[PDB]
Structure formats: structure tokens, C-alpha cells
Amino acid sequence: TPAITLENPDIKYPLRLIDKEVVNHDTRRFRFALPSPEHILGLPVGQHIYLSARIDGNLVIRPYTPVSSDDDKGFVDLVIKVYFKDTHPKFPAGGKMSQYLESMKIGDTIEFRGPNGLLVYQGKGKFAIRPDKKSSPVIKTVKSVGMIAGGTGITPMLQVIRAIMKDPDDHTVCHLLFANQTEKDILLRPELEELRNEHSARFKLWYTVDRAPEAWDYSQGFVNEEMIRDHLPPPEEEPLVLMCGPPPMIQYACLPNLERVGHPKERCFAF
Ligand SMILES: Cc1cc2nc3c(=O)[nH]c(=O)nc-3n(C[C@H](O)[C@H](O)[C@H](O)COP(=O)(O)OP(=O)(O)OC[C@H]3O[C@@H](n4cnc5c(N)ncnc54)[C@H](O)[C@@H]3O)c2cc1C
Ligand SMILES: NC(=O)c1ccc[n+]([C@@H]2O[C@H](COP(=O)([O-])OP(=O)(O)OC[C@H]3O[C@@H](n4cnc5c(N)ncnc54)[C@H](O)[C@@H]3O)[C@@H](O)[C@H]2O)c1
């Protein structure tokens, strides 16, 4: 068995940045080396890590959700949106940690800790979900999972999707509804469409964008009732519905429409 990196969630492990790849205009994949090429991160599927640093004199701690897995020896991949300064009128300073990360050079290090999170995917449709941080996991096994992601909210979904597709005996069907501001904002589109091409029986894919291009074959606007009805499994099939995105997407676009369609709160989970 491979050596684990994250052995205690309170210990800080400095990892070195070894690669960075542009995902799109504001998003990148950051690859960090584990302590040896034979190490694994130690990451139950669905959990996240925290990065921390002193930035401009203040402690800054932020969670990020690896898109890699414990099958990936020697590295961890994060997919992170950079919030640039002098860009958005409401946030002229931009984002602290994301800009710090964008400024890192290959070879620089930052401290990781984890893993954390209330959901663990245990394979073959089986989810272990704690009601909160002080309770025991409730083990819920389903035949299908609805996934509603907005922007970088794609990251926990991709962890779960990849874990499922890797196991040919995992027959769980994932239905992803992925919302972004524009077509160019769709993160990891090639990766997602390769998954669709290779696993269409287990992976259903739909997009919505705030603003649609001329020739568009998907949906437009915030997540609405029609998209949930048409692009997630019906409530009669008792799927789990996983959500991840901006808090108002969850509060105003997801929850009320899940209610309208008939997905009970018990079947729903927000990362
Ligand atoms: C459990 C969990 C897991 C997460 N995993 C991921 C992940 O895998 N990948 C990821 O990218 N994020 C993830 N996030 C978000 C992440 O933790 C940070 O909140 C994010 O990176 C911003 O932090 P910051 O320090 O750069 O910005 P902050 O300084 O804390 O805040 C800036 C905020 O103002 C807004 N803002 C600032 N500048 C702009 C701009 N130019 N345009 C638009 N809005 C702007 C944004 O809302 C931004 O969050 C996750 C959040 C949670 C709770
Ligand atoms: N809790 C987690 O595990 C986790 C993991 C990754 C990301 N996230 C969160 O996901 C968000 C990603 O932000 P982003 O900058 O990439 O998103 P974004 O601003 O680019 O918005 C993406 C989509 O979210 C929806 N949305 C945004 N504002 C909305 C509103 N007021 N009402 C209804 N829908 C709205 C839209 O469909 C939009 O296209 C962040 O808030 C981040 O913290 C959470």
C-alpha cells in the first residue's frame, strides 16, 4: 500500500508547485508534487483540502477540491479560478488566495491540510454522508445521481464522476447540469465531453450559460425548473441530488426548483 501524505487533518504539509495549465481565461489547473513519486494524497472521494498562507500580513485559509484521486501517484491537481483585481467593479481588490496562487512560480511551496467534507463516495453507488460535522455518516446507495454545478463547483462533481467511470462494475448513472456565465467560461469542457463520448450510458451532460452564443444547442439562463426536470433523473427514481456552486445558485436557483420538481430535501446534498 502506497504511503499517504495527509495523515492527520491538523498537520500542515508544504507541497511544491510543479505544473500549471490554463483551463480558460481565468481558471487554471495547478499540479503539486506529493512528498515522493510513490505517495498518494490520502483523499476519500468527494472530500477537499485547505491551503493556507500569510498574504499581505493576514492569515488566509481557503478550501480547494482536488480533481485527482488516490490512484494518482506523486501529485495532486487543483482547478482554481483566479479572481483578478481591477476587473470587477464590486471587487476591485480581486481575491486574496487565488491571486497569490496565480503569482506562484514553479518550485514554490504552499501548505496543504485535510482531507475534509461531509460526503464520501465509497463506490458502486454508495455514499457516506454525515448530517453535520458531529454526526455519524448515513450510508445511502443509489442507482443514479443528479449533479448541479456552477463554475468551479464542478470540482467535487468531477471527483465523483471520474471515480465512477473508472470502475466498469460501478453502474451508477450521473446526470450533470453545469452552469457558467458564458460559453468560454465552461470549465474542463474537453474533459467532460470525452467522458460523455466514452461513457454515455453512465454520464448525461447538459450545460446552461447566463449568456448564450449564436449557435447554441443547450440551455440559457440561471438553473430553472425546466432544466432540473429535463436533465436530472426524475424523483420517482429516488436519485441523490448533489449541488455545488455560488451560494445564491444553491439558495435561489436549485432548492426552490428541486422542490417544485419533487426532489425531497433528504435526497439533496450541497457541498
Ligand atoms: C468546500 C469548498 C471547496 C472549494 N473548492 C474550490 C475549488 O476546487 N476551486 C476553486 O476555484 N474554488 C473553490 N472554492 C472557493 C475557494 O475556497 C475560495 O473561496 C476562492 O478561491 C476565492 O478565494 P480568494 O482568497 O481568492 O478570494 P477572496 O479574497 O476571499 O474573496 C473574493 C471574492 O470576491 C469576489 N471577487 C473578487 N474578485 C472578483 C472578480 N475579479 N470577478 C468576480 N468575482 C470576484 C469573489 O466572490 C471572491 O470569492 C471552494 C469553496 C469551498 C467552501
Ligand atoms: N462548497 C464546495 O465544496 C465548493 C467547491 C467548489 C466551488 N464552490 C463555490 O462555487 C462558486 C463558484 O464561483 P464561480 O466564480 O466559479 O461562479 P460564477 O460567478 O462564474 O457563476 C457560475 C454560475 O453560478 C450561477 N450563479 C451565479 N450567481 C447566481 C445567482 N445570484 N443566482 C443564481 N445563480 C447564480 C450561474 O448559473 C452562473 O453561471 C464559489 O462560490 C465557490 O465557493 C464550492
Swiss-Prot record:
Modified residues (N6-acetyllysine): K12, K20, K90
Major site of localization recorded for this protein: endoplasmic reticulum
Claim: Iron is one of the keywords in the record: no
Documented effect of changing T65S: Similar properties to wild-type
Coiled-coil spans in chain: none
GO biological process: cholesterol biosynthetic process
Cellular location(s): Endoplasmic reticulum membrane; Mitochondrion outer membrane
Keyword Protein biosynthesis (UniProt): no
Pfam families membership: FAD_binding_6, NAD_binding_1
Assembly and oligomerization: Component of a complex composed of cytochrome b5, NADH-cytochrome b5 reductase (CYB5R3) and MTARC2. Interacts with MTLN; the interaction is required to maintain cellular lipid composition and leads to stimulation of mitochondrial respiratory complex I activity.
Family of this protein: Belongs to the flavoprotein pyridine nucleotide cytochrome reductase family.
UniProt-recorded name of the protein: NADH-cytochrome b5 reductase 3
Origin species: Sus scrofa
Gene name tied to this protein: CYB5R3
